[PDB]
Amino acid sequence: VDPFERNKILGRGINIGNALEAPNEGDWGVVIKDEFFDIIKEAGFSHVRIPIRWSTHAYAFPPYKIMDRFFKRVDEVINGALKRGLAVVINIHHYEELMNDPEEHKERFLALWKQIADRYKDYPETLFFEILNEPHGNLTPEKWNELLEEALKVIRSIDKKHTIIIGTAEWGGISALEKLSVPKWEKNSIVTIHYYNPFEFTHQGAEWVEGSEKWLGRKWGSPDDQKHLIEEFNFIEEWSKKNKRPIYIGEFGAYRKADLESRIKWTSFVVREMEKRRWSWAYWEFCSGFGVYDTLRKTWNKDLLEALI
Numbered sequence: 001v002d003p004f005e006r007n008k009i010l011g012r013g014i015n016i017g018n019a020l021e022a023p024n025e026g027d028w029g030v031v032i033k034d035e036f037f038d039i040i041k042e043a044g045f046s047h048v049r050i051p052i053r054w055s056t057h058a059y060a061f062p063p064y065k066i067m068d069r070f071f072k073r074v075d076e077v078i079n080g081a082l083k084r085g086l087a088v089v090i091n092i093h094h095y096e097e098l099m100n101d102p103e104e105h106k107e108r109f110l111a112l113w114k115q116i117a118d119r120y121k122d123y124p125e126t127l128f129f130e131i132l133n134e135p136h137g138n139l140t141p142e143k144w145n146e147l148l149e150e151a152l153k154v155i156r157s158i159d160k161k162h163t164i165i166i167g168t169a170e171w172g173g174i175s176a177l178e179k180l181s182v183p184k185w186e187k188n189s190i191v192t193i194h195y196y197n198p199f200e201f202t203h204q205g206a207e208w209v210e211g212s213e214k215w216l217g218r219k220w221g222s223p224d225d226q227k228h229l230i231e232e233f234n235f236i237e238e239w240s241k242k243n244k245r246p247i248y249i250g251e252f253g254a255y256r257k258a259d260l261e262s263r264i265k266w267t268s269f270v271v272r273e274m275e276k277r278r279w280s281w282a283y284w285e286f287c288s289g290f291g292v293y294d295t296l297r298k299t300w301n302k303d304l305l306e307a308l309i
């Protein structure tokens with residue numbers, strides 16, 4: 001299998017967030033309606049990324065069994081998307097104890113991946129396995145290198161067909177990319193990066209971010225703006241060429257509080273620069289605080305959808 005061809009198949013996408021990665025689906029404002037897949041496919045997207053919180057739906061002690069009821073729900077989400085001809089990225093996302101206590105939670109994490117790989121091993125090749133969303137905290141770059149290799153071994157003992165998606169430590173951005181090590185023996189993986197630069201721009205006024213109001217009225221689109229973003233993407237590209245790993249920008253987006261123009265400029269510029277590099281990508285996110293589709297009103301944000309598609 002050619003991971004670069006798989007990365008093309010992945011192509012352009014959107015996160016369905018604040019859904020299955022909450023403690024329970026619906027706790028953070030989104031429930032994944034089957035209808036979403038028609039809406040997303042009709043808009044021109046190639047895939048969906050489904051953040052999933054397995055840790056709150058599995059037993060705490062060995063054999064760490066994932067609940068039947070939750071597996072059936074995930075089946076339903078995956079198959080709903082596949083049915084529209086969309087590719088699907090599933091992950092483990094918000095395993096909070098793992099980030100803080102990797103030494104204890106490694107065993108449970110790997111048992112989760114054994115179960116997941118086993119259940120979906122015969123699913124279409126348009127399903128992608130993303131090991132872990134944004135490794136951070138006590139799960140350092142070195143420890144992530146250790147964990148991801150063990151995850152690869154566990155998954156590969158079960159499934160050698162599906163493409164695996166591997167993120168970076170220190171919250172999944174470009175800072176820890178140079179530290180990232182993918183075993184040479186693994187030949188069907190895509191590296192994922194989450195891009196929100198400039199952070200002060202994209203997160204201006206972000207309520208969950210400390211002192212973010214200091215950045216309100218921040219604009220983007222200037223020409224140093226463009227030089228810098230191009231430079232940061234050149235770094236990613238270079239690493240990609242040197243290591244021969246395809247790239248997936250699994251998350252990117254600018255908060256609402258950002259002005260709609262600069263928002264448009266930033267979004268359309270990021271998109272065009274990613275597509276120059278043949279990178280797959282997923283906008284964060286479908287319908288929440290960074291949402292481009294209002295689910296109550298059933299309307300797309302036309303300006304932003306145009307920037308994306």
Ligand code: NI
Pocket residue numbers: 057067069070
């Ligand atoms: Ni349950």
Ligand code: NI
Pocket residue numbers: 142
């Ligand atoms: Ni060391």
Ligand code: NI
Pocket residue numbers: 196
């Ligand atoms: Ni963020």
Ligand code: NI
Pocket residue numbers: 200
């Ligand atoms: Ni500042």
Ligand code: NI
Pocket residue numbers: 302303
């Ligand atoms: Ni307009």
